[PDB]
Subunit: 246 residues, 4 copies
């Protein structure tokens, strides 16, 4: 090849929770860099909308419903990718959720964070790995959170499931490296998405003095899933303007 290694020409990319925000920028970006994209979401309307806009833009995409915590949903996506495009070379695990919860929280909540943030993406990684190997190499990207490394009040379930996403990333890179597969994570800072007094106090400890755009994350994501990052694996890259947003 003679194109820059910053493209995904030939690639096939599953992006989860991609109807809005970071996930949506990743889907559009991966497509414009030459990937055929499988957009998934909890609501298929949002997923299909994203896929259609990609198709409109010149790229190749399909849009699907996926509850990443549902086994038959996870397997359906894997099947749909191969049926449509014939291989899987990139997995972006962007689906997740949760937030401040009190210490005394119900035990169904604590277990939910791990079900949602961890178990889903680990399983999705097991499912994709065999196919990426057959394709002769892949990249997995986990969208984690800065809470995975920060410490604060009300963060028992969210902070600890994210810290777990970080370390699974660092360890499975050992498992799947010999299969040709790289595994990294991005910890995004606060993303300005859909009150200019609260903004000045969100950015009190942010050196670059602005909120993120979803496109900042997607740029970092494209680098990390591209051949320009071919020798990078097991890494957690924090994209937050140099500090913490609160």
């Amino acid at each position: 090849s003679y194109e820059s290694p910053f493209h995904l020409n030939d690639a096939v990319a599953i992006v989860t929770g991609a109807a809005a925000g970071i996930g949506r920028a990743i889907a559009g970006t991966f497509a414009k860099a030459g990937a055929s994209v499988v957009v998934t979401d909890l609501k298929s309307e949002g997923a299909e909308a994203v896929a259609a806009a990609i198709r409109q833009a010149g790229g190749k995409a399909i849009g699907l419903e996926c509850n990443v915590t549902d086994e038959q949903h996870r397997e359906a996506v894997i099947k749909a990718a191969l049926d449509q495009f014939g291989k899987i070379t990139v997995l972006v695990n962007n689906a997740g959720g949760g937030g401040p919860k009190p210490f005394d929280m119900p035990m169904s909540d604590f277990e939910w964070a791990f079900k949602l943030n961890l178990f889903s993406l680990f399983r999705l990684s097991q499912l994709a790995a065999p196919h990426m190997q057959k394709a002769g190499g892949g990249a997995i990207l986990n969208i984690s959170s800065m809470a995975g490394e920060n410490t604060n009040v009300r963060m028992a379930s969210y902070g600890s499931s994210k810290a777990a996403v970080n370390h699974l990333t660092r360890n499975i890179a050992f498992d799947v490296g010999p299969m040709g597969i790289r595994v990294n994570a991005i910890a995004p800072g606060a993303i300005k998405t859909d009150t200019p007094e609260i903004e000045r106090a969100m950015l009190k400890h942010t050196p670059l003095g602005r909120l993120g755009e979803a496109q900042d994350i997607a740029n970092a994501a494209l680098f990390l899933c591209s051949p320009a990052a071919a020798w990078i694996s097991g890494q957690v890259l924090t994209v937050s303007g140099g500090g913490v947003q609160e």
Copy 2:
């Protein structure tokens, strides 16, 4: 000397043998009354008996820490017997090397046993520690929570979640006067292969269970009163592999 647990009540889980037993023994001799727990209660009872024989206050219970009934029984049984809970040592856990393509039940059990169990106990134990004007939680983690290897997907990531849970709940239970810390212990002896195990261990010897109990005592004592949210690696300066 603030390195003594005089007037203290400590639950110590998975404490039949190994690290948990040496911590149960040591805290007892440190001045504390000990609710020893274990999967198999003949293991638990034996340790409790040997403490009483040595001249200390203790009781031994069966507890499968992944059982909400077993968990609450331990709390009640601590309270009936000794009148309060002041120290909780989460030593029960398990797992190890497992292939990347393990069954999901294997993966989930790692979290159930190593993480879910100890987070509940902490919740259960906490209000009583507050009611006692303060306390200390101590989690026995693993170096796998910090290190990176092959076959470590479930065991490494769950021990990593335990470390960061420790750092974060220190913020929640801090205002309740509770301190939360963890220990990551190296390879514990509890001749040819031993030289090779020691290849990246600067102190040139394998661990003793007591080494861990010594650090456990410091952290759970008033001499570490302004220590919270920490993960202390006790491994002679390196990794045993």
Copy 3:
């Protein structure tokens, strides 16, 4: 796309060979006018000439980064050549394994060359980058700044100082519009190493490298291009480890 250095002026230090040289060539390809620097001026001149012949803009200059007059000379010369400074890559550095009982001068020298030099050049470059409305500084650190081992008192601690300096001065120069990041390369098969490297040493180095290869100079240059481009407009204070997933011990 956002991966180009259109209109940029980059100083790349210690850049006659290896990682420095791949960064200089790649930044020039990406659109930057490049001031290639090296202890040996003929070496820097050679890379600048290749950049020029490949259809790019570059000069090569002598520079001992530990010499205050060389540093300021370099800064003035980049401004005399191209009118502004928007990118600084602090690739010059050195040192390695040293006994615990090493003379103090060995220990201090690791800081002088690895840390004091790149701190001073960042100071000198910063007000120029602010006048040009934006900058990126990139420090080439090392995995030794994170790992622990025998014979690393001066090399490891000096590189850990680089990593943390990077995290901290990000706070200082972010309000000037400057981003500061570092790369910590693992073992990179340059022609310095590839000559010395035996197949059986290489195998020991691959033992704990999940990707099954040593790195190439271009791996580092690609990472460096990302980190100094618009594609990383919102990344500062980071240390990106490029190590193929593990360690090369």
Copy 4:
């Protein structure tokens, strides 16, 4: 207890006041013959005299830790007075917030004082520790070694160097019978100027709701230099009430 310094000879630098003084007094009480060091000799001997009264053994010497002739004189004074060296607490240090554009002399000085000095004294002590069949080195670092703020170029980066040096020389000196550890103290309420709303601010992210005491650190120092930590080496122990004091 295993938390005693019986038969120990401990050198403690910067010990006229604050943390250094408390470590010295505490080490004496735990059985150590203490060599008390300070920039001002009258301060060093004041701590030494006080110790001698309360029932321990301590000499007081003047020492600028950045001066080789001084460093060597403490070493010799300890051997002459007590016959051996088994423990070294490198507590002497300094610096703090500095502007980015600081003169190089200031940047370089943070290293001469916080790092070059403790490394040299470790070099000097180590042979006498080996000849005595073991010892412990304790570096007093700072939370600046790990945290990130404005104005921390010289101070933060020198303390990070201290931390990583501790991790690394643990390897060089462990086969000599020597452990090397560090303490990163938070804000410690020594005799040091602090107002009510300043202190309230520092407590905002301290979970335990109090600043620390010199004795908090001394206790941790005692643990780390005692046989109860005989298998602990290369560690950085943060004593900070569970959070940060900023």
